[PDB]
């Protein structure tokens, strides 16, 4: 950054990025509470070490999961905003340093706004962006019915983070707004639970489709 103290920021306290603490952070959804890691972890970066196991994601910090979802490249095999995005070389895939700075600028943004811990804001956003029921087709005696099902909290997290990031991506695509700004907007919008957020909207639609399916 252009302040030289943000450029050579030195950590001292083991806050997250040496800037934001998590002791004051609380998650009121009990199904997500175990699966949301909020340890005093200075650097979110893990080096893949969790994926080889089945719930290392549970053991993994949450802002790390965010930046990893932000290392995105848009949507290649699906259509967010009705559009394939397909950034190929000008993406952030495998660029976690860029992703880290994107997330950090987003947090700084919202905290300039929102007068709140941005991690608190983020947990609120995934909470009210995370669905509870989905639908899937099951066979009973050989005949398929699009039944409704409940969603496991890990999968709820996965969806929430994914579609937060995807909304940010669609809003930053081919327009004047930055990825960080789109991300900030998406998180606070979802936390306020307004439909402007792609993520809240998507949660509501899969949920109303489920409550239609049963």
């Amino acid at each position: 950054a252009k302040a030289l103290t943000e450029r050579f920021y030195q950590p001292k306290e083991l806050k997250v990025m040496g800037r934001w603490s998590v002791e004051d952070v609380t998650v009121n959804d009990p199904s997500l509470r175990p699966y949301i890691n909020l340890e005093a972890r200075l650097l979110p970066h893990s080096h893949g070490r969790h994926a080889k196991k089945a719930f290392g994601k549970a053991n993994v910090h949450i802002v790390e999961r965010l930046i990893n979802k932000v290392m995105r490249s848009g949507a290649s095999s699906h259509k967010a905003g009705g559009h394939f995005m397909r950034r190929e070389h000008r993406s952030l895939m495998s660029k976690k340093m860029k992703a880290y700075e994107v997330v950090k600028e987003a947090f700084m943004i919202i905290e300039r706004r929102t007068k709140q811990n941005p991690i608190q804001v983020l947990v609120r956003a995934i909470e009210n962006s995370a669905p509870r029921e989905d639908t899937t087709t099951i066979a009973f005696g050989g005949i398929r019915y699009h039944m409704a099902v409940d969603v496991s909290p890990l999968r709820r997290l996965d969806i929430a983070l994914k579609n937060i990031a995807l909304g940010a991506s669609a809003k930053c695509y081919r327009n004047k707004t930055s990825y960080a700004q789109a991300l900030a907007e998406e998180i606070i919008a979802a936390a306020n639970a307004d439909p402007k957020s792609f993520a809240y909207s998507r949660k509501e639609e899969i949920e109303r489709i489920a409550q239609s399916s049963r």
Binding site: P11, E13, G18, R41, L42, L43, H45, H47, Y100, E101
Partner: protein, 132 residues
């Protein structure tokens, strides 16, 4: 002149740290950690220091020579080397356990290496394949 040598490895990156009594100066290839330009690399290297605390760092001086692959690998190898240096300088197992529960790979190494590339579109990867 009590000095202690430690070493760290992270995928084609080798750091050699020497630790001794001093003031708190810690240098990576003649350069202060304070000014290492990617924040992430700085933070990888600093984690053991923050975690161990100023109380002992301020009496320690460290110098790391790292001669390998990438900035991140170098940072991790340095992190390893200085973590081991602190532990072997202090003989504090409460600190060893603090590190081992924060990140075990801080003291044990990451054993991972790159998988050899295999024929079909070998330049891309061992499993990356041509299109049908």
């Amino acid at each position: 002149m009590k000095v202690i040598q430690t070493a760290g490895k992270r995928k084609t990156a080798i750091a050699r740290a020497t630790i001794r009594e001093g003031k708190g100066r810690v240098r990576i290839n003649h350069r202060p950690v304070e000014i290492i330009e990617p924040e992430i690399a700085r933070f990888t290297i600093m984690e053991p220091l923050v975690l161990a605390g100023e109380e002992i760092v301020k009496g320690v001086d460290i110098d790391v020579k790292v001669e390998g692959g990438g900035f991140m690998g170098q940072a991790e190898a340095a992190r390893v080397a200085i973590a081991r240096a602190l532990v072997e300088w202090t003989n504090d197992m409460n600190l060893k356990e603090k590190f081992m529960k924060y990140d075990r790979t801080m003291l044990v190494g990451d054993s991972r290496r790159t998988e050899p590339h295999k024929p079909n579109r070998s330049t891309k990867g061992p499993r990356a394949k041509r299109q049908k």
